[PDB]
Structure 1
Amino acid sequence: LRNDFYRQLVGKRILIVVNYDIDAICASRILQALFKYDHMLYTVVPIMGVTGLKRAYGEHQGDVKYVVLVNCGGCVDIVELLQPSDDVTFFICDSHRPLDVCNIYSDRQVCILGDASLEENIPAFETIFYDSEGEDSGAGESDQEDQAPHEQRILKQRARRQWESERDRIMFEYTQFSYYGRSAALMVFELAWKLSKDNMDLLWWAIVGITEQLLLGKIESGAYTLELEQIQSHVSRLTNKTNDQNTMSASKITFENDLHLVLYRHWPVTESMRYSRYSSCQLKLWTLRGEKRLHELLLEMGLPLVHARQTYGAMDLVLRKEFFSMVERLAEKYDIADIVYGTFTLSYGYRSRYAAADYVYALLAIMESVKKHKTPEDCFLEASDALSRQHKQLLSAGIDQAKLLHAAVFRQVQSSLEARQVHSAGSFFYYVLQEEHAFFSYPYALGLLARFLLRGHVATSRARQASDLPLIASCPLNASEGMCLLVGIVPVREDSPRNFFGKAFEQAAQKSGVALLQDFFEPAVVQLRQSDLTRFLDSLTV
């Protein structure tokens, strides 16, 4: 709620955007445009890690007043992290919600965006700093010698009894599981919508923001079949032209019920039915048989084979219009059910009609971990200079790069699987890897690696005993002399039951502890030494 605070925002500021994301750029370019509206100059920021943030504030170590960070907050008791913070205006708006309340209270230098149907931590502070044992609050925080306005020292006994019996819920917070919550800038759309901004491109940008982690398999939407009311209610109800829409530029954007198979639009088919997980794994194509069952479905559709190696755009007409008009009904009965989802589309003009999510699979492929040593931040500056209507020579290069990665992905999966590199190693499953790729250096592509092997093996070689068990993976960086990256990932098909691994790896860190890092605001990640994991893995079993 800043229909009241936004009228504070005229003077100088700093607009930070914590570590790379599509929520990031989407929620921030809009604010760039907003703040060049009422004549203020401002600052956009790259974060490569929390050290980059602390040196950034060090680099911005002034008394700048309206300082902002978005999509972060769970790092420290940020008053403790931040010394010169005395009365400065801070702002969070983060969807990684499970944050401690030391950051929430002290109502001078934070903004409590607390609003949810979960009144779950109301007394959560009434004993941590308010009470203490082995240390005048008139509590355990103060003296405990029968001086606080069955024995003289059962004071501490009741104190710790309450403390620990409700650490049953403190250990529930930040020590069992993590997630994200709500949108990144849909709140910001409805904020700005009071100020008469009918920027259709802003709607597209927020659609990009949601359809990243609308991936109901990756991160939950929840609002989805409710936003089929909500977002249309934003846009559809207010029609500027009931009769004049046969226009060239930026025709008022639309919504249709289509699919999430990869790049149906810009490529041929029979390679693009091959690289997604949900279509592939449920048809098992890395074995020979899957091509045959695929072929016998192509029979029932009776598309030509020659056509199925032509670009969908390049086909003749009637098939390429009737395609999805067929596929939605005679795919439900042949092992695959749930690729059809709710998304948008629009053209600028005559060139072709871009697909409302097909940018994000180019954006994820704009993470070029090149050896030039500069390119992450340049990738950011390219990305946010991409989402417009203007810069478009580069989006095609993005698509090309994306597809060649996505068809390099499988190339390792067949290699790894039928050699049976699926090491069980006890309570969970376990994977190991040997040398570097420019493909899968960084971890986004690494989770994409894991989330094809996982479905493949765990669905197809077992009974139903072990189909619900979690995942890990190595990933070496010949970049930095040997660090042996790792990421934690969840078991099958439990949308709300998300990661144990917000901290869970730290068990072995607690036991032995070896050079571990958590440099990212991302929890679902760790960083190590080159080969000092084996005994740490023997620890990290349980």
Structure 2
Amino acid sequence: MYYGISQFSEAYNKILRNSSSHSSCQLVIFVSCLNIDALCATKMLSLLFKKQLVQSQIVPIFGYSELRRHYSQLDDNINSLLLVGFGGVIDLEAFLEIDPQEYVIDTDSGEQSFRRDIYVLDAHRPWNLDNIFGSQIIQCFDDGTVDDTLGEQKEAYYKLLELDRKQRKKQIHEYEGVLEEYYSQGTTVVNSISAQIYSLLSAIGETNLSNLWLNILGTTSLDIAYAQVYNRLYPLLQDEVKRLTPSSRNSVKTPDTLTLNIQPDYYLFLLRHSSLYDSFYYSNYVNAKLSLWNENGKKRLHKMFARMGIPLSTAQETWLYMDHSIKRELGIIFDKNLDRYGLQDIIRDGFVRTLGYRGSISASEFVEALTALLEVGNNSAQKLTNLRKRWVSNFWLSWDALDDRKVELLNRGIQLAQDLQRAIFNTGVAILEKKLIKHLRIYRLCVLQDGPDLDLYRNPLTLLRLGNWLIECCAESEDKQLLPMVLASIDENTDTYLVAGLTPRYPRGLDKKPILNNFSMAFQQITAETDAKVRIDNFESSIIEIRREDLSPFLEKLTLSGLL
């Protein structure tokens, strides 16, 4: 529709025509922080506009409240915005209080043109149809979804817009039915924003190994939650790695050689920086398969290394210093053993990068380091604002870690990733030991009232780490029905729970159609009925924060609602 996958080039040419000059800064990029894919997309975008010498500004934004703040203080000189990683799922034209007759210029002719473009780079679905069809200013980059799927909804939208008698009543009732069946779909991410920008770079001819690595990184960040999308996009990344890889073979390792490979990248947590033992131990998938949160699962992991013939001391060596023969042989050892434990999906081919002699890093490890920097890198409303400012400031640590000139900062990210995952694991074993999960009929509920690490889980990404750890543990059990989950943690300073509504998912190795997050609109509907003072301004609208006293009324109304 607005800009299809075939015509991102026209949008980029328009950006240069409108908003490039030696004279003035004219382009503003709003990027949702606490989103790796949006970060990588903005990095690629900023390198493009660096090479093309477009004077531009990047603002990292936490949520919709900060969006409407910052948008309200943009000068008329700013005639293009790029909204990266948010804004598709909401009527931005209404939300930002746009009037096209307040933005129109040079209409002459049956024609219109405007003093500010607002381009939207978002992978979230369902699209708000006022962005896609209603607005003449909001300009969404589409993966193909609108043309592939939304023909009936397009028809219904335009006819209901035109349809201002019994036939008339039946028609407007019908198209209201279509649009209210399209809305009240659960939320879901269908693409990587970074691969979307990579398709733009492919259309311009700007592809190179830096931009390909950023595409790989932003795409790899989807792998935990949105494995089906990652499996859609992985073959195209293989094609581009082969296309850009240089032609020399049996190449001698040299200080200048950046080599980006497809090779075995196991589903283990930070293998090349953890010990081998810790890389099994702190992996979400390994914990799910082995039930590692208890002593019997720990015994099973020891049993595994014993049957592999690996001494436990060797397994606990830091991977650089771990025995070279074991590292050369590790693929064979895994092949010969991991089917016996059901861990055969540990085997995977993923993207590994090495730059001269300073050692290999996979896209898996790199996105873990970047998330760690986002999470922990550095009157109640004021304290909340200061907290959100800390998270905005963490964005630039992840940003700077994307540059090879600052690999010490990436190493900080690696260390913080290990310690974060340790905190996740300890809180997780607390939940599963003490059985904090309550099996309500429609969804599973978990509420963290007290304990250590509670001051971490006020960050949305760290809460989602614990959620994903728990959900991997649930998915790999045939005992449990695949119910949606609510996970909450109190902030004892603000006196508000942070609450996350989480999808289930099928076990990791199996293949079906994706299952959608309907906590987003369910939370909206309860928020619309209730007197409770809940906030819903986070970009990932299935995450909210709610005052402590309001939680039990809220969850009671949630479980009495039929929306889940």
TM-score category of the 2 structures, normalised to the smaller one: 0.7 to 0.9
Greater share of helix: 2
Deviation by residue 1:65-116 (Cα, 9 ceiling, x = unmatched): 2222222223543333324543122212211131122112256423353453
Q: CA 1:419/1:183 → structure 2, altered by over 3 Å: closer, same or farther?
A: closer
Deviation by residue 1:347-389 (Cα, 9 ceiling, x = unmatched): 2222322223212212222223878754222211121111111
**Which amino acid is the alignment partner of residue 161 of structure 1?**
H
2:193 match: 184
Report the secondary structure of 2:412's partner residue: helix
Q: CA 1:476/1:411 → structure 2, altered by over 3 Å: closer, same or farther?
A: same
Alpha-carbon distance between aligned partners in 2 of 1:130 and 1:217, rounded to the nearest angstrom: 35
**Which amino acid is the alignment partner of residue 368 of structure 1?**
V
Q: Provide TM-score, normalisation by structure 1.
A: 0.86
Q: CA 1:204/1:511 → structure 2, altered by over 3 Å: closer, same or farther?
A: same
Q: CA 1:102/1:246 → structure 2, altered by over 3 Å: closer, same or farther?
A: same
Q: Does 1:285 align with 2:315?
A: no
TM-fit CA distance, 1:316: 2.5
Instruction: Give the one of 498, 501, 514 matched to 1:485.
Output: 498
Is residue 174–residue 502 contact of structure 1 (8 Å, CA) maintained in 2?
no
Instruction: Give the one of 401, 404, 420 matched to 2:419.
Output: 404
Instruction: Give the one of 47, 52, 77 matched to 1:38.
Output: 52
1:67 match: 81
Greater Cα radius of gyration, structure 1 or 2: 1
Greater share of strand: 2
Deviation by residue 1:308-344 (Cα, 9 ceiling, x = unmatched): 2211211232112211232134202222221222311
Deviation by residue 1:207-242 (Cα, 9 ceiling, x = unmatched): 111110033656631324533653335424xx3656
Q: CA 1:59/1:180 → structure 2, altered by over 3 Å: closer, same or farther?
A: same
Is residue 89–residue 108 contact of structure 1 (8 Å, CA) maintained in 2?
no
2:175 match: 163
Instruction: Give the one of 451, 461, 464 matched to 1:444.
Output: 461
2:151 match: 122
Is residue 276–residue 318 contact of structure 2 (8 Å, CA) maintained in 1?
yes
Instruction: Give the one of 383, 394, 414 matched to 1:379.
Output: 394
1:113 match: 141
**Which amino acid is the alignment partner of residue 532 of structure 1?**
D
1:144 match: none
Q: Provide TM-score, normalisation by structure 2.
A: 0.83
TM-fit CA distance, 1:534: 1.0
Is residue 18–residue 71 contact of structure 1 (8 Å, CA) maintained in 2?
yes
Q: Does 1:426 align with 2:441?
A: yes
Is residue 283–residue 294 contact of structure 1 (8 Å, CA) maintained in 2?
yes
Deviation by residue 1:164-192 (Cα, 9 ceiling, x = unmatched): 4xx2x323323031101112122322332
Is residue 489–residue 524 contact of structure 1 (8 Å, CA) maintained in 2?
yes
Report the secondary structure of 2:265's partner residue: strand
Instruction: Give the one of 7, 13, 23 matched to 1:7.
Output: 13
Is residue 417–residue 457 contact of structure 1 (8 Å, CA) maintained in 2?
no
Deviation by residue 1:25-63 (Cα, 9 ceiling, x = unmatched): 211122222222233211111102112112212221324
Report the secondary structure of 1:6's partner residue: helix
Q: Please, what is the CA RMSD of the aligned residues?
A: 2.8
Alpha-carbon distance between aligned partners in 2 of 1:246 and 1:369, rounded to the nearest angstrom: 33
Alpha-carbon distance between aligned partners in 2 of 1:25 and 1:294, rounded to the nearest angstrom: 36
**Which amino acid is the alignment partner of residue 177 of structure 1?**
G
1:368 match: 376
Alpha-carbon distance between aligned partners in 1 of 2:226 and 2:361, rounded to the nearest angstrom: 24
Q: Compare 115-124 and 25-34 and name the one that shifted more.
A: 115-124
Is residue 99–residue 174 contact of structure 1 (8 Å, CA) maintained in 2?
no
1:222 match: 231
Alpha-carbon distance between aligned partners in 1 of 2:344 and 2:361, rounded to the nearest angstrom: 25
Q: CA 1:214/1:240 → structure 2, altered by over 3 Å: closer, same or farther?
A: same
Q: CA 1:369/1:505 → structure 2, altered by over 3 Å: closer, same or farther?
A: farther
Q: CA 1:432/1:495 → structure 2, altered by over 3 Å: closer, same or farther?
A: farther
Alpha-carbon distance between aligned partners in 2 of 1:250 and 1:189, rounded to the nearest angstrom: 23
Q: Compare 349-358 and 26-35 and name the one that shifted more.
A: 349-358
Is residue 19–residue 521 contact of structure 1 (8 Å, CA) maintained in 2?
no
Q: CA 1:325/1:224 → structure 2, altered by over 3 Å: closer, same or farther?
A: farther
2:71 match: 57
Alpha-carbon distance between aligned partners in 1 of 2:293 and 2:253, rounded to the nearest angstrom: 46
2:549 match: 531
**Which amino acid is the alignment partner of residue 103 of structure 1?**
N
Is residue 259–residue 355 contact of structure 2 (8 Å, CA) maintained in 1?
no
Q: CA 1:162/1:517 → structure 2, altered by over 3 Å: closer, same or farther?
A: same
**Which amino acid is the alignment partner of residue 499 of structure 2?**
L
Q: CA 1:427/1:131 → structure 2, altered by over 3 Å: closer, same or farther?
A: closer
1:16 match: 30
Query: Unaligned 5+ residue runs, structure 2?
Result: 1-6, 105-113, 507-511
1:208 match: 217
TM-fit CA distance, 1:516: 2.9
Deviation by residue 1:404-423 (Cα, 9 ceiling, x = unmatched): 12112222233232323222
1:307 match: 314
Q: Does 1:392 align with 2:407?
A: yes
Query: Unaligned 5+ residue runs, structure 1?
Result: 142-152
Q: Does 1:497 align with 2:515?
A: yes
Q: Does 1:271 align with 2:278?
A: yes
Q: Compare 432-441 and 116-125 and name the one that shifted more.
A: 116-125
TM-fit CA distance, 1:474: 1.6
2:352 match: 345
Alpha-carbon distance between aligned partners in 1 of 2:226 and 2:347, rounded to the nearest angstrom: 13
**Which amino acid is the alignment partner of residue 122 of structure 2?**
D
Alpha-carbon distance between aligned partners in 1 of 2:421 and 2:250, rounded to the nearest angstrom: 43
Alpha-carbon distance between aligned partners in 2 of 1:278 and 1:211, rounded to the nearest angstrom: 16
**Which amino acid is the alignment partner of residue 466 of structure 2?**
L
Alpha-carbon distance between aligned partners in 2 of 1:241 and 1:298, rounded to the nearest angstrom: 38
1:332 match: 339
Q: Compare 250-259 and 109-118 and name the one that shifted more.
A: 109-118
TM-fit CA distance, 1:156: 5.3
Report the secondary structure of 2:173's partner residue: helix
Alpha-carbon distance between aligned partners in 1 of 2:474 and 2:208, rounded to the nearest angstrom: 46
**Which amino acid is the alignment partner of residue 469 of structure 2?**
F
Deviation by residue 1:487-533 (Cα, 9 ceiling, x = unmatched): 11122417611212231233433544522322022122122112212
Q: Does 1:94 align with 2:103?
A: no
2:181 match: 172
Instruction: Give the one of 349, 358, 365 matched to 1:358.
Output: 365
Query: Between Structure 1 and Structure 2, how many residues are aligned?
Result: 516
Alpha-carbon distance between aligned partners in 2 of 1:129 and 1:437, rounded to the nearest angstrom: 49
TM-fit CA distance, 1:392: 1.6
Identity of aligned residues (%): 25
Q: Does 1:522 align with 2:522?
A: no
